[PDB]
Structure formats: C-alpha cells, structure tokens
Amino acid sequence: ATFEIVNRCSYTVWAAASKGDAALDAGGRQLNSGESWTINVEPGTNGGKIWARTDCYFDDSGSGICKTGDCGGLLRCKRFGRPPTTLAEFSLNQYGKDYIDISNIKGFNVPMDFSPTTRGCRGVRCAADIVGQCPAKLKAPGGGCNDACTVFQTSEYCCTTGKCGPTEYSRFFKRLCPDAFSYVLDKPTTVTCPGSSNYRVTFCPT
Incomplete structure (x- = not known):
C-alpha cells in the first residue's frame, strides 16, 4: 500500500497516480530531479496506474497543462493521463495476490522501473530510449x-x-522493452506478487 515514487531523471516530472475514477493518495505532485514521493494506495485497489508527466505548468489552484500525461489540467490527478504515458499498472489484493506490470499500450514518455520493496517477486523495467x-x-x-x-x-x-x-508498431515497443505490454493482446508480462506488497516506481532508473 506504500508506493515510493522516485525521479532519477535529470529533469523535473509531475508524478500522477489514479485508478481512473478517483485519485490514489493526493493524485499528483511535482518531483524535481532526485526527489522521492511516498504515497499510500488503499488495499484492494483494482486497475491503479502511476505515471510521469513532462513539461507542466500549474497555477496557484493546481490547474494547468502538461505536454505528456495531462489529466484534465489538474496537478492532483483524478483520472488517467493523455498519451503518451509509460504506465506502471497495478491491481492489489486480488484473491490474495498483487499483480503488477508496465505498459506501453498508451505510448512512452519517461523510462520506468517498477519493483517491489518487499520479498516474494521480481520487478519490471522499460528503460530504453524509446523516444529517441x-x-x-x-x-x-x-x-x-x-x-x-x-x-x-x-x-x-x-x-x-x-x-x-x-x-510493426507494437513490435518496436516490444523490441526496446520486452518486459512491457506493447499491445492489448500482448503475451502477458504481468508479475504476481504477495498480497499487500510494497513498491517503488523509479523514473529514469538509468
């Protein structure tokens, strides 16, 4: 239920966390180069997603725009973000287990490592230069x-x-990032973790 969101990128990103109809924790927050943001995700969260947003401008009330991953112009995201967004996807406490993956089905903006901070499973990663x-x-x-x-x-x-x-297009994402979904019906790269595991999402894991 704790997700530590770390920005290893050299540029600022605005983290976002949502399950589509509601925010997870505050839903969003700026992360300058090297900063860490630990959020709480309620157990049993189904279809939750974490992503980065690039090149954002928000006013004093938290309204504005991002060039990737914008979620209705809100800093605190209540819904999913506009592609392209590398997606850390998770459904927690599903009949005793957590299920995690990384998805390029909605595009790619920022490289990402999505790993448990507790025992019992492996992490996944898409850190290739898909944009270049x-x-x-x-x-x-x-x-x-x-x-x-x-x-x-x-x-x-x-x-x-x-x-x-x-x-031809999905195979490009799969070539650079085999461990992430490249299209809807891709051979699953989902990782089963113990129920109630904890996690870390590192942008630009290098």
Whole structure:
C-alpha cells in the first residue's frame, strides 16, 4: 500500500497516480530531479496506474497543462493521463495476490522501473530510449512516442473487437522493452506478487 515514487531523471516530472475514477493518495505532485514521493494506495485497489508527466505548468489552484500525461489540467490527478504515458499498472489484493506490470499500450514518455520493496517477486523495467528511436509516424510533437491506437484509431491497433495481432508498431515497443505490454493482446508480462506488497516506481532508473 506504500508506493515510493522516485525521479532519477535529470529533469523535473509531475508524478500522477489514479485508478481512473478517483485519485490514489493526493493524485499528483511535482518531483524535481532526485526527489522521492511516498504515497499510500488503499488495499484492494483494482486497475491503479502511476505515471510521469513532462513539461507542466500549474497555477496557484493546481490547474494547468502538461505536454505528456495531462489529466484534465489538474496537478492532483483524478483520472488517467493523455498519451503518451509509460504506465506502471497495478491491481492489489486480488484473491490474495498483487499483480503488477508496465505498459506501453498508451505510448512512452519517461523510462520506468517498477519493483517491489518487499520479498516474494521480481520487478519490471522499460528503460530504453524509446523516444529517441521512436518511428517518425509515432513521434508526438509535444514529446514522447505515441502508441499506434492513439495515432491511427483502427480496430487493429486499438483491439476494439478483442481480436488483434502484433503490428510493426507494437513490435518496436516490444523490441526496446520486452518486459512491457506493447499491445492489448500482448503475451502477458504481468508479475504476481504477495498480497499487500510494497513498491517503488523509479523514473529514469538509468
């Protein structure tokens, strides 16, 4: 239920944590280079996500915009963020176990390591330079590397009908980051941890 969010990047990021219809803990917070933010996530949180946001500007009330991962213009995120967003995904206390993964299904913006701080399982990582190697048609002018579903809005890329295969675009993400989901029906890279494990999300783990 504790997630330590550490920014090893050389640039500032604004962390965000949500399960889609509500914030987790405060939902969001600035993290300058090297800073750590420990949040509490309620047990049994299903479909929670943590991500980084880049190039944000927020007013005194906490309203503004980010070039990647913006969540309705709020500093304290109440909903998921606009792609591209490397995603740390987690569902806790599901019939006795935690389940974690990293997903590039909504694009890539910041490299990420997602690891337990307690025993019983391994971590996952996507720390390759996906933005620098991004295919031209996936490059997001605002920053990051978009997934093909946000770029092209096709049943095949978005897996709308629950039937879809890998694509030239999903194989790029999978080549650079095998341990992260590259498309909806990707062979699962989910890691089963003991129920009520604790975690650490490190941006730019290097």
